[PDB]
Amino acid sequence: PMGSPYRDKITIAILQLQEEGKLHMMKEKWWRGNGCPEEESKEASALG
Amino acid sequence: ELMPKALSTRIVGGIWWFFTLIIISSYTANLAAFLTVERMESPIDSAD
């Protein structure tokens, strides 16, 4: 809210998590899903 | 052993040589992929 005693406590706390890397660990925990098998997965090409 | 003599038949001899040049060249370039068979790749490789 408009002036809170919990902004600066979290502002320091978010900076701790990306220093430890846990904001990157939780990033790779949810956004990483199936690899979405790429366009370079030809494996066969009968010329048509 | 039979070769075209008139220019009326050289272009038929000319284009058909260029046609069978690209057919055999596209055949050999693709058949390297199909004899080098990419093996069985069941889409689980580790615990990750």
Ligand SMILES: CCCCCCCC/C=C\CCCCCCCC(=O)O[C@@H](COC(=O)CCCCCCCCCCCCCCC)COP(=O)([O-])OCC[N+](C)(C)C
């Ligand atoms: C009668 C047969 C059966 C009936 C069937 C009908 C067949 C009729 C045949 C053709 C009519 C049109 C067919 C469909 C249209 C494609 C053509 C075209 O659009 O332009 C093409 C021109 O490409 C060329 O120029 C090809 C000719 C090369 C010159 C050959 C000279 C050989 C002489 C040397 C001899 C040396 C002798 C040696 C001894 C001295 C390129 O354009 P495109 O990319 O193809 O167009 C795609 C559209 N797009 C651009 C948006 C993607």
Ligand SMILES: CCCCCCCC/C=C\CCCCCCCC(=O)O[C@@H](COC(=O)CCCCCCCCCCCCCCC)COP(=O)([O-])OCC[N+](C)(C)C
């Ligand atoms: C190994 C020794 C053999 C010698 C033969 C040499 C023959 C002459 C060789 C090359 C001449 C043409 C060179 C340009 C081709 C580039 C691709 C292209 O443009 O396609 C485009 C349309 O297609 C065209 O606009 C080309 C139309 C002519 C095609 C027929 C040429 C063969 C001649 C027949 C006579 C057979 C032989 C005669 C004797 C019997 C498709 O669109 P694009 O690809 O997205 O556009 C990229 C354009 N770019 C790459 C230019 C930027």
